[PDB]
Amino acid sequence: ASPFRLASAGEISEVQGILRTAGLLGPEKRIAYLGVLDPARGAGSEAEDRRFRVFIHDVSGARPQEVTVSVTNGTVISAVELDTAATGELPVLEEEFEVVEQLLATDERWLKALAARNLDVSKVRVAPLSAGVFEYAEERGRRILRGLAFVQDFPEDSAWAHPVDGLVAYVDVVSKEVTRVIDTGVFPVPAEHGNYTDPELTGPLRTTQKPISITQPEGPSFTVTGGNHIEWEKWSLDVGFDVREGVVLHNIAFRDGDRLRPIINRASIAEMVVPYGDPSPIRSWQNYFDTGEYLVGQYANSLELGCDCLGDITYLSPVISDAFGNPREIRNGICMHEEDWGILAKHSDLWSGINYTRRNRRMVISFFTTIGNYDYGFYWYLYLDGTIEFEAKATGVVFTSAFPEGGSDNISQLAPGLGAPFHQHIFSARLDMAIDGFTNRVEEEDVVRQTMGPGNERGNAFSRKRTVLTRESEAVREADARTGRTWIISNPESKNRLNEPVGYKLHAHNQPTLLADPGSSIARRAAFATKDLWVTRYADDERYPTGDFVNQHSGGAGLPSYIAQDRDIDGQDIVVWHTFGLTHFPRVEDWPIMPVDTVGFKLRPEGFFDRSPVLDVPAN
Ligand SMILES: [Cu+2]
């Protein structure tokens, strides 16, 4: 009954029939993106209208379309042709991935390059990578992938241990032709294997680990109704799933006594960029927008009980569309469970004789995606005390290269002759705020040091200041860890019992933002990654910080273009965009498979409640 329910297999079949009956989904058509649209802004929005947005690719070379359909009417609402040279190519299709290796295997330049290295072509895997926008005019308007080669000594061999440096090819995957093959010289192919299930590398497994059993003999404390609506320890929200963004959180709210108080209207990771910092021509074009170009949702893993998710697990199995409009189920794609989180609050009072201890808990919503060599886990946490946290967990196999004789300033060595180029993993969280409702404002809070003098005679005082961001043109902010900079999102029209505006404080990790030169191609396509915090006035069509079509787009779209409208944000329907990321200088311990590293952010209440909201937690 809820308009935020997950898309069903039946709705996706219906979309397929509608597009077919309308003549839009012929044999040469492919769905490159399909997802449900959010309900438009309407406090009394009654008539449900499940609409879906579709990107339709044409394998014949015809122009692609963006289409919106109403499954709640059986009709097509809109259909537009796209000029991809102007506004960007569609996201990469899964079936295009393998074409790169097969096209290259019959190309004379490629085989000549392999023969000079004594490589057997049937043993050479090609990683199909997004192309970006650089100095090649012939690529404009065409759908291009680039390919780097790795040797697989046998079918179960880890190819990442054997990169073929000095070689790269570009491929047009619509016309199926190899545009270029570049060979800058031969490097030895690193010989050691990186097979982390081979007993000769692992040695005998440990026998010292005894089991940890986590059970809930009365089942979990949260309830799921309507497929995806969660209630847990005064929290209320809907778990959505989009093939591009992955897990999305809707209608995050908290039951403060009698009333349900909104906090966040929609929360998602709206983009993710991985820029590489190796200046070699073989790799200096390498940047993937895993969300915008590949769609992290469609590579979600099925999560195995006891290995990926431990405890009393409730699963969601979201449904997406394949390239032809048939429903595909991701079995066990989302884990939800609650977990113990240590002491919540504690005090032993000498004067009163009362000893008081309460334990904390968090609700966990997670999924895991695999893109080529990388694996990323996405974790949302909700705590008893009203804190919201996001955590990214990065693992997988590092992207490799040769390690040059004589060292490198932009690559680290993992093994004899084997290198790993420096790179970043940078995320953009889109937080459509609704602190006690939709009239919100953002203030920047800095610590203020005070000078010893009159009024401060002992030189101990210190303070803080808050600056209201009133217009979009002044709402592009950077971190300042040294002055304890945070940002407060408040509602100036909703006051707590002390007559203060209610609010939430955003705590950033203050990791470095995009390191590339501001004149570079990647600084233009990933402009959002150059600043820690952006605030925009809400609009229906401003969904992604890089725009709708990231693949091979020239740059500037998204946030810098939104901000230029200079709209009023002082007490309005606003959206916060937080950039945060990992700067990865790979280490020996990352090889042959890398332990998890983490980055994230959190929001804590700042005078939102009238007192601690966990006074009613029992002792247990
Ligand atoms: Cu990394």
From Swiss-Prot:
Signal peptide (residue range): none
PTM text: Topaquinone (TPQ) is generated by copper-dependent autoxidation of a specific tyrosyl residue.
Cofactor(s) the protein needs: Cu cation; L-topaquinone
Cysteines engaged in disulfide bonds, as pairs: C309-C335
Catalyzed reaction equations: a primary methyl amine + O2 + H2O = an aldehyde + H2O2 + NH4(+); 2-phenylethylamine + O2 + H2O = 2-phenylacetaldehyde + H2O2 + NH4(+)
Protein keywords: Copper, Disulfide bond, Metal-binding, Oxidoreductase, TPQ
Pfam families for the chain: AGAO-like_N2 (PF21994), Cu_amine_oxid (PF01179)
Induction conditions: By phenethylamine.
EC number: 1.4.3.21
Residues binding Cu cation, per UniProt: H423, H425, H584
EC category name: oxidoreductase
GO biological process terms, semicolon-separated: amine metabolic process
SUPFAM superfamilies (UniProt xref): Amine oxidase catalytic domain, Amine oxidase N-terminal region
Active site residues according to the UniProt entry: D290, Y374
Cofactor note: Binds 1 copper ion per subunit. Contains 1 topaquinone per subunit.
Location of 2',4',5'-topaquinone modifications: Y374
Superkingdom as given in the UniProt entry: Bacteria
Family matches, as InterPro entries: AGAO-like_N2 (IPR054157), Cu_Am_Ox_Cu-bd (IPR049947), Cu_Am_ox_TPQ-bd (IPR049948), Cu_amine_oxidase (IPR000269), Cu_amine_oxidase_C (IPR015798), Cu_amine_oxidase_C_sf (IPR036460), Cu_amine_oxidase_N-reg (IPR016182)
GO function terms (MF aspect): copper ion binding; primary methylamine oxidase activity; quinone binding
PANTHER family for the chain: COPPER AMINE OXIDASE, COPPER AMINE OXIDASE 1-RELATED
Assembly: Homodimer.
Family listed: Belongs to the copper/topaquinone oxidase family.
Role according to the record: Catalyzes the oxidative deamination of phenylethylamine to phenylacetaldehyde with the concomitant production of hydrogen peroxide and ammonia.
Name assigned to this protein: Phenylethylamine oxidase
